[PDB]
Nucleic acid binder design. Structure first.
Ligand SMILES: [Mg+2]
Ligand SMILES: [Mg+2]
Ligand code: NA
Length: 327
DNA sequence: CGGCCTACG
DNA sequence: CGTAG
DNA sequence: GCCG
């Protein structure tokens, strides 16, 4: 009754097992900080199964038969049901390793590998890193300077204002080009830690060379606090605030219109949903999916899609709107 | 046991 | 190495 | 860590 892949079931943004899923996600995150991608995936998948359930789990019984619940994830749930806390989860939460790896990986320009090296070198705080600025790339310097602003969520109000400024630059760069809001906001989130836009043009090929032209125009308007032929730009933008402004992460992506459904699908997420969807495509259907297309490796052909609905149909999956992709 | 998404900057 | 979802 |  519960399918094994997250792309086979609706997953709403809000649900009935919030505390249980949050605890499993702490363990998933900690597994990632240790380089255990397999354990991260299992804990993420188990958390996502709980998000997809129609009511709260109240008894351990109710996990029997659910995919991705074995001895470890079931024991976590059991401890939470019986005591309101799970000792393993709380030990992770308060550990110096978890807290520092979380802080460091939050920095734009710092991943697990860099964070882990710094941790092993004895660094623990953002001010530790600031004192050693020759250890830092230009990207990391920007991430560190702007870390406080980037730690505060963006509201949907802010997003609409940003979209209008991006649309103005895009229209000068290439009249007729369009801007679509993707990422978590397209899935219905009311807040988020960045904003994602997908840009195309209805005439195939006109979008070639577009992103540099857009970036130059936004920089000329004084809106770009940090960036840098290309088709994805990971920026920090100046967002107006009453009497001042704040830094916001914005991603801009260009795709040809032939690829737009695939890029829209990919950039709308969630991250787990897209990993599960690509895994399903390859392992169950023998087709290879990315943000550019869907390849049949036996006929050596690409599926044409005119819509996300087309892609779900190609893959034999019932359509899920973005609001049900919150795996 | 092997496998765990698949790209671009 | 970083980034994305 | 779990699935197949
Ligand atoms: Mg986003
Ligand atoms: Mg983003
Ligand atoms: Na980071």
């Amino acid at each position: 009754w519960m399918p094994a892949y997250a792309c086979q079931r609706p997953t709403p943004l809000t649900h009935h097992n919030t505390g249980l899923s949050e605890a499993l996600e702490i363990l998933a995150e900690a597994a990632g900080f240790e380089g255990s991608e397999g354990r991260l995936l299992t804990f993420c998948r188990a958390a996502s199964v709980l998000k997809a359930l129609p009511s709260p789990v109240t008894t351990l019984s109710q996990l029997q038969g659910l995919p991705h619940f074995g001895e470890h994830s079931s024991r976590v749930v059991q401890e939470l049901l019986e005591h309101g806390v799970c000792e393993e989860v709380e030990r992770v939460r308060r550990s110096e390793r978890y807290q520092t790896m979380k802080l460091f990986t939050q920095i734009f320009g710092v991943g697990v590998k860099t964070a882990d090296r710094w941790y092993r070198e004895g660094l623990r705080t953002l001010d530790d890193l600031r004192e050693q600025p020759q250890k830092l790339t230009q990207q990391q310097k920007a991430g560190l300077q702007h870390h406080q602003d980037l730690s505060t969520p963006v509201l949907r109000s802010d997003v609409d204002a940003l979209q209008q400024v991006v649309e103005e630059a895009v229209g000068q760069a290439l009249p007729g080009a369009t801007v679509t809001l993707t990422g978590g906001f397209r899935r219905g989130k009311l807040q988020g830690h960045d904003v994602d836009f997908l840009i195309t043009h209805p005439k195939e090929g006109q979008e070639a060379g577009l992103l540099p032209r857009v970036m130059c125009r936004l920089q000329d308007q004084g809106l770009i606090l940090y960036h840098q032929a290309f088709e994805r730009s990971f920026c920090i933008f100046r967002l107006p605030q009453p009497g001042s402004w704040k830094a916001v992460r914005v991603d801009l992506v260009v795709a040809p219109v032939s690829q737009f459904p695939f890029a829209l699908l990919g950039w709308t997420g969630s991250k787990l949903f897209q990993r599960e969807l690509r895994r399903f495509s390859r392992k169950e259907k023998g087709l290879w999916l990315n943000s550019h297309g869907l390849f049949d490796p036996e006929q050596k052909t690409f599926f044409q899609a005119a819509s996300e609905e087309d892609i779900f149909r190609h893959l034999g999956l019932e359509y899920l709107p973005p609001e049900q992709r919150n795996a």
